[PDB]
Amino acid sequence: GHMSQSNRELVVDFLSYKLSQKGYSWSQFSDVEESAVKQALREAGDEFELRYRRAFSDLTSQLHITPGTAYQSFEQVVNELFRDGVNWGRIVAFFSFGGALCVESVDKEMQVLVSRIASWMATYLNDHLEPWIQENGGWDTFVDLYG
Amino acid sequence: XIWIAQELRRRGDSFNAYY
Ligand SMILES: [Cl-]
Ligand SMILES: [Cl-]
């Protein structure tokens, strides 16, 4: 539906932004082709990175990421992150995490992971974050708070 | 991941409080 599609598009926008910010291009990894929401998310993401990038500088080594272990590892991290609840900050961390994982993957010859991560992010957002989001003011409220 | 997820929780929570 329009809802699921918009969340998938939001993920593409954020990751494309993040990937391009690092000298990469979305088209290099996927054939899948500014609203205030997208703008606010890109901005929150940058802010989170400017604050914690260094501590999250080597995700693939810390998690021992390989094409064969990425699937389960990603899911375990996101499940633990939201195991007891959700807030906008954790959602931003979720995005930054996914974005950082995408960049590192291509930098470390695992570009095949970009499309998968994008889908994993969008699927988790739609199935396990959307409910909290719509019950907490929706993305519009996120824009008002982090805009 | 557990360790990474918990770093994201504490930092996401710190980030949340700031805004
Ligand atoms: Cl740390
Ligand atoms: Cl906990």
Residue numbers in the entry:
A (entry chain A): -1 to 31, 83 to 196
B (entry chain B): 145 to 163
What does the publication say?
Another subgroup is composed of antiapoptotic proteins, BCL-2, BCL-XL, BCl-w, MCL-1, A1 and BCL-B, which contain the BH1-BH4 domains that are arranged to form an extended hydrophobic groove known as the BH3-binding groove. The antiapoptotic BCL-2 subfamily proteins bind the BH3 domain of BAX/BAK and of the BH3-only proteins through their BH3-binding groove. Anticancer BH3 peptides have been developed, especially those derived from BIM, which interacts with all of the antiapoptotic proteins with extremely high affinity. Herein, we describe the embedment of the Akt recognition sequence into the BIM BH3 peptide and the cancer cell-specific apoptogenic property of the resulting BIM BH3 peptide variant characterized by X-ray crystallography, calorimetry and cell-based biochemistry.
